[PDB]
Design a protein around this nucleic acid. Structure first.
Lengths: 104, 63, 191, 76, 313, 141, 227, 141
RNA sequence: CGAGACUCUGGCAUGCUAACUAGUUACGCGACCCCCGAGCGGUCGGCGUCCCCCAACUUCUUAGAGGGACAAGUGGCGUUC
RNA sequence: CAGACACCAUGGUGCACCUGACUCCU
């Protein structure tokens, strides 16, 4: 029986995230699952304001570093074991892929 | 006044004219896609300036 | 409305644009037929956008100065449309046309630019632009409005209507009649 | 699959390894030696293989010393 | 021979009117593919104020519709557009009956059959995709199918034979049979890359014209060369008339129209005015199409006008 | 319809009279002397704002799915004038604004419902749309 | 994500393991010619892969040192048994490995060789292995209390805009002296910028490649064959 | 179900989506007409194009609008650009090119740019100054 | 070498790809239902709420590929560069 | 080319330093 499994994908490298999300959607249809598609959750812009000048006599030089993480979920109406079986294999580097029993 | 054409557009467009004067035309979206076809330009905007100056050249050289 | 567009509570028609140089810098009914003075919220995008903005809309613009009053056109257009009401109950005339006459008698004719002569102060008899003649009209009109209200029972609208009426016909009780003439004084003056 | 080495003792490579690490054939292996005239004992080179019948020997024939060197068969 | 006085002008376009198409039921319908990312339907008033009124806007692409082709009835609009998609519109309303994703590059060509089933498109992706009306790419004609940009795929009227007469940027015309997609012939020996190609309206004779603009005539039933009808300027559109053999060349400085049985020039529909710059001066006819009858010669230029000519002696 | 179709400033005063037509609107024991908000330099002119505030609350809860104590406290306050310091928005009293809520709940003008708090009563959906028509038929701003 | 640290915090916390590891193995694996680490997240195994130019000191004898090199990493940085499996990485080129070169030049400058001559030896050698550009800066006090800077540049070095950041391989070494500290600052602009395979950020933004036409000409008459 | 077109009208951060659905209904900006929320000082602006086009173009459709973002003033142009575009998009696909063009002809001589998007947004703030272009008060000797 | 080129951002993509951590419109639209108004009243239209679906779509929204800006165009000017 | 032209003082200190080789043995 099917079991609507969320596949949450978090990364900061978009085209790394995109090339793995391409693997998950196709490989779910390569060996048949639900295929649903990329539910584009918005990116989170982690912005931190820093001093560019230590021992800051002179000019107030402000420096800001941003880091953008990128979320998306893939809910799959598909049989619970072989959802996580086909997807979670063969992807070790670069991209966190979170298959999820919930949204049952 | 600004964004006047530097050395990189004119030197690149010159080689394009003398080899492709048949397959070049005067429509930009022709020549922009022709500079997609016949050239390897590391930017669309650089290709906009090159193939646009190709249309600048092709209008001149057909005179 | 598709035949003729008027002002929000007055008429853009029956407006007597009666200066020599100030044609097509003063227009309320020619292309600028507006119930609501607001173009896009910017007026310094071009040098052209000055003559694009009508004098009725620049008045709502040139009023909001004085940083506590800056960034407030909704207070301004209120007080500006209040000021037209205070014109008509003092005049009976079209208060746009009073405002349109107020640009006329407040616009200078010849002014002076600075020049040097033997260490002594002389100034060159020059015309100003009819763009500037409007801009020297409006800014002197906008000065006497907030100033006379600033420690008086009268609001700015009561002072601005008195500023327009006494500059619609020069009465030297509006600030704009009194300061135009000092600008025009220097032209027939030095050298 | 290569077994990168920081040294590789006296049965170095280039028909010194065509019968020692494995029995199955290889393509070509670079060594800094000129492996015919000096008979010089030196290792800064590598060992390229095809990885069909090569993995069984060298992971028990790592960590060793044919001369006084130390074979690090770390496969990648 | 006969002549053509200026019957009128069409109005109402943004960008260059890249193609024009009549449906066989309505010669009062002209579907004019303009560079506004939205083809305009024109139900022809045949007026002197305009020649027609804008009937529909088939709204929306990401780039320009190069070739357009109507249903043989006048109900559907195949806007083969440079967004990568051909879009089969409901020509009466809007309403894409089928967007054709699958051409990876700018869709140069589109053809819609007398069968009203065969959709064949050529593009800058150097593919020839025999689509179906549901977007089913029934076959993508490749493997020496114009190894340069596929310029324009053209139907022989498919009651004669199921032929795509496809010209390309490889100075060739690849003439195929359909549903097997092997060459009826490759027309070899053209000068200049072939911007356009036409059929005789029985699928009988093949005329090919391009960059050099030499209207090379071929026995389309044979793939054997008749002669080279002589243009010389870059032909942007060729079309035999459906009522007589009048092939017309959409060229740079003019519109060279001829009689083709026998070979004589009928007129030369001019398109130039005095605007000397002079690298900026001349407009060109980028598209000519006949009427549904072949009485009105529609000429969709690069000037946002389609000047028309009912044949008047 | 809604009450958003009719004049809101008439609505917060016609329903204020309707809460006076209710006769009770469950006023707190402290409105003659209170600060009532850290935004206000002065105590209120009267006590009859409390009808208007609940006439402003029941209109607000007609549109929500339900709200309560913190939601009313951002509505009626504004810039807290910080004297020698820059002024900032905050929230005033959370007791009298809750006293508003328990009143309209007690009169069944709004009622404790879903979405965490008080949504309209259907009697309130009548009595708002009743006085909405009383707002609308009188004048239309 | 509940109930861990934030997904905001997690991708913050990913580099925090990276920084303390690289600083520590700069302090100890510089004897390997420390080119870096490679922590590969694999199931049931933390594949740490030690990038170096002398990988004959990573195991010691019979994997001796790895069982204390991992026992630093596996035990201090939160790893179970069998997780941290150490791997060598003897990098193929080293002349494109300025990190290991400013390491190795410090084995010629702090290790002992003449100032120009070591900068003749290595700067040639990093160009011998290949460089679009390669530069050597030794900055600070020398010959008493006066600060000096020794620039040894080879190849092409660009600095414009955005491709200054992609195209180079840079190394700074704080070499300690009996009189001060100098900075061995070695940058190598990558020869694999338009190539290898290909390099970063589509080939050079000041450059355009075209293909040759070889088309649209013919001697032939128009004559076809049925195919 | 009834025929409809969806559009948008845009200020800096203000998108108002109006579905110009066939039938008989108002221009319901958030379900209500324009005599609501009370900015009502730019009130002649948003009421202007309906007078110039006639309400029968807008009353031959129901226009219910969803609006979000911006301030009060940013939404006034956001709804005025939208329902102008709603009326164009209704006639263009469904009814006629000629009326929507005449609608486009009516909207454009006073030209509030009610059919094209506007690229004006808030400029990105850089450091070293309290303003987007203005800098701090400087001190010299 | 810098600068340009280049990156990123503001824009322009009812094209295109995705959505049940977004939604939207869409129904039957009911329901809390208000007659407020039309409509006798249903229904309509109604802010929310929800029936909401195995509706639909990505329009809003998100983020993905793309395209769009190049005097490019035109028409003057300028070594006519 | 071709309209109008005033006085305005002073002031100071260290490091620019004189040769070649390439058995890293890969």
């Amino acid at each position: 029986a099917i079991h609507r499994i969320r596949i949450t994908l978090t990364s900061r490298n978009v085209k790394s995230l995109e090339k793995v999300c391409a693997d998950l959607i196709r490989g779910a249809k390569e060996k048949n699952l639900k295929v649903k598609g990329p539910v584009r959750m918005p990116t989170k812009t982690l912005r931190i304001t820093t001093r560019k000048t230590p021992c800051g006599e002179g000019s107030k030089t402000w420096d800001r570093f941003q880091m953008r993480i990128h979320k998306r979920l893939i809910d799959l109406h598909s049989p619970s074991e072989i959802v996580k079986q086909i997807t979670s294999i063969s992807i070790e580097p670069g991209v966190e892929v979170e298959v999820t029993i919930a949204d049952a | 006044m600004g964004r006047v054409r530097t050395k990189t557009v004119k030197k690149a467009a010159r080689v394009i004219i003398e080899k492709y004067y048949t397959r070049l035309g005067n429509d930009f979206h022709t020549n922009k896609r022709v500079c997609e076809e016949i050239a390897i330009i590391p930017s669309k905007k650089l290709r906009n300036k090159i193939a646009g100056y190709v249309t600048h050249l092709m209008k001149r050289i057909q005179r | 409305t598709p035949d003729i567009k008027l002002f929000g509570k007055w008429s853009t028609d029956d407006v007597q644009i009666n200066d020599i140089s100030l044609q097509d810098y003063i227009a309320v009914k020619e292309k600028y037929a507006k119930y609501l003075p607001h173009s896009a919220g910017r007026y310094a995008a071009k040098r052209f956008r000055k003559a694009q903005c009508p004098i009725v809309e620049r008045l709502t613009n040139s009023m909001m100065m004085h940083g506590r009053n800056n960034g407030k056109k909704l207070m301004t257009v209120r007080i500006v449309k209040h000021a037209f009401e205070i014109i008509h109950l003092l005049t009976g005339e079209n208060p746009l046309q009073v405002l349109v006459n107020a640009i006329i008698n407040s616009g200078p004719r010849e002014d002076s630019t600075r020049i040097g002569r033997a260490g002594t102060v002389r100034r060159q008899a020059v015309d100003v632009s009819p763009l500037r003649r409007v801009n020297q009209a409006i800014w002197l009109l906008c000065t006497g409005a907030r100033e006379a209200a600033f420690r008086n029972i009268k609001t700015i609208a009561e002072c601005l209507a008195d500023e327009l009426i006494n500059a619609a016909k020069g009465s030297s009780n509006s600030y704009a009649i009194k300061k135009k003439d000092e600008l025009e004084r220097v032209a027939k003056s030095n050298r | 699959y290569t077994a990168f080495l920081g040294n590789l003792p006296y049965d170095v490579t280039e028909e010194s390894i065509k019968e020692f690490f494995r029995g199955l054939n290889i393509s070509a292996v670079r060594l800094p030696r000129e492996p015919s005239n000096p008979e010089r004992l030196k290792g800064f080179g590598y060992a390229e293989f095809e990885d069909l019948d090569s993995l069984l020997s060298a992971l028990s024939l790592n960590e060793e010393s044919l001369g006084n060197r130390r074979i690090r068969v770390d496969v990648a | 021979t006969e002549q053509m006085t200026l019957r009128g002008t069409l109005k109402g376009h943004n960008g260059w009117v890249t193609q024009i198409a009549t449906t066989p039921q309505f010669p009062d319908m002209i579907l004019s593919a303009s560079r506004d990312k939205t083809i305009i339907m024109w139900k022809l008033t045949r007026d002197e104020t305009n020649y027609g009124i804008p009937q529909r806007a088939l709204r929306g692409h990401s780039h320009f519709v190069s070739d357009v082709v109507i249903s043989s009835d006048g109900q559907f609009a195949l806007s083969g557009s440079w967004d990568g998609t051909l879009r089969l519109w409901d020509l009466t309303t809007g309403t894409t009956t089928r967007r054709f994703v699958g051409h990876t590059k700018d869709v140069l060509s589109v053809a819609f059959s007398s069968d009203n089933r065969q959709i064949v498109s050529g593009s800058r992706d150097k593919t020839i995709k025999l689509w179906n009306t549901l977007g089913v790419c029934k076959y993508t004609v490749q493997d020496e199918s114009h190894s340069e940009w596929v310029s324009c795929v053209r139907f022989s009227p498919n009651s004669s034979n199921p032929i795509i007469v496809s010209c390309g940027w490889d100075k060739l015309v690849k003439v195929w049979n359909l549903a097997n997609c092997k060459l009826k012939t490759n027309h070899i020996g053209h000068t200049g890359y072939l911007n356009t190609v036409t059929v005789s309206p029985d699928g009988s004779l093949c005329a090919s014209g391009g960059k050099d603009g030499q209207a090379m005539l071929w026995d389309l039933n044979e793939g054997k060369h008749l002669y080279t009808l002589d243009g010389g300027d870059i032909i942007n559109a060729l079309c035999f008339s459906p009522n007589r053999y009048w092939l017309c060349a959409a060229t740079g400085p003019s519109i060279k129209i001829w009689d083709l049985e026998g070979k004589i020039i009928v007129d030369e529909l001019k398109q130039e005015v005095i605007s000397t710059s002079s690298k900026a001066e001349p407009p060109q006819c980028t598209s000519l199409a006949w009427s549904a009858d072949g009485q009105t010669l529609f000429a969709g230029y690069t000037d946002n006008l389609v000047r028309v000519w009912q044949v008047t002696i | 319809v809604t009450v958003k179709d009719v004049n809101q400033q008439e609505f917060v005063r016609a329903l204020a009279a309707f809460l006076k037509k209710s006769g009770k609107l469950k006023v707190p024991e402290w409105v003659d002397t209170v600060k009532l908000a850290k935004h206000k330099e002065l105590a209120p002119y009267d006590e009859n704002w409390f009808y208007t505030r609940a006439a402003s609350t029941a209109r607000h809860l007609y549109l929500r799915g339900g709200a309560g104590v913190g939601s009313m406290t951002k509505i009626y306050g504004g810039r807290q004038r910080n004297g020698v310091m820059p002024s900032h928005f905050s929230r005033g009293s959370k007791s009298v604004a809750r006293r508003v809520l328990q009143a309209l709940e007690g009169l069944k003008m709004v009622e404790k419902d879903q979405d965490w708090g008080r949504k309209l009563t259907p009697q309130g959906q009548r009595d708002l749309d009743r006085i909405a028509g009383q707002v609308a038929a009188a004048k239309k701003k | 994500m509940a109930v861990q640290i934030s997904k905001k915090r997690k991708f913050v916390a990913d580099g925090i393991f990276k920084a303390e590891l690289n600083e520590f193995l700069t302090r100890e694996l510089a004897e390997d010619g420390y080119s870096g680490v490679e922590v590969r997240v694999t199931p049931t195994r933390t594949e740490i892969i030690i990038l170096a130019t002398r990988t004959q000191n990573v195991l010691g004898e019979k994997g001796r040192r790895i069982r204390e090199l991992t026992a630093v990493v596996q035990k201090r940085f939160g790893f179970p048994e069998g997780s941290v499996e150490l791997y060598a990485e003897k990098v193929a080129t080293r002349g494109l490995c300025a990190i290991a070169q400013a390491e190795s030049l410090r084995y010629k400058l702090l290790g002992g060789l003449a100032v120009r001559r070591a900068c003749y030896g290595v700067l040639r050698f990093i160009m011998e292995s290949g460089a679009k550009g390669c530069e050597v800066v030794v900055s600070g006090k020398l010959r008493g209390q006066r600060a000096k800077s020794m620039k040894f540049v080879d190849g092409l070095m660009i600095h414009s805009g955005d491709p200054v950041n992609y195209y180079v391989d840079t190394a700074v070494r704080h070499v300690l002296l009996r009189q001060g500290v100098l900075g061995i600052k070695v940058k190598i602009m990558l020869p694999w910028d338009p190539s290898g395979k290909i390099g970063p950020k589509k080939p050079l933004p000041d450059h355009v490649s075209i293909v040759e036409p070889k088309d649209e000409i013919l001697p032939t008459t128009p004559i076809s064959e049925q195919k | 179900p009834l025929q409809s077109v969806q559009v948008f009208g845009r200020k800096k951060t203000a998108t108002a989506v109006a579905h110009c659905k066939r039938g008989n209904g108002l221009i319901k900006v958030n379900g209500r007409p324009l005599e609501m929320i009370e900015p009502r000082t730019l009130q002649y602006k948003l009421l202007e194009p309906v007078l110039l086009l006639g309400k029968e173009r807008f009353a031959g459709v129901d226009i219910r609008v969803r609006v979000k973002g911006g301030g009060h003033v940013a939404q006034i142009y956001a709804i005025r650009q939208s329902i102008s575009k709603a009326l164009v998009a209704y006639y263009q696909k469904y009814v006629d090119e000629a009326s929507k063009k005449e609608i486009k002809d009516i909207l454009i001589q006073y030209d509030r740019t009610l059919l094209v998007a506007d690229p004006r947004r808030c400029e990105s703030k850089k450091f070293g100054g309290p303003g987007a272009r203005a800098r701090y008060q400087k001190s010299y000797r």
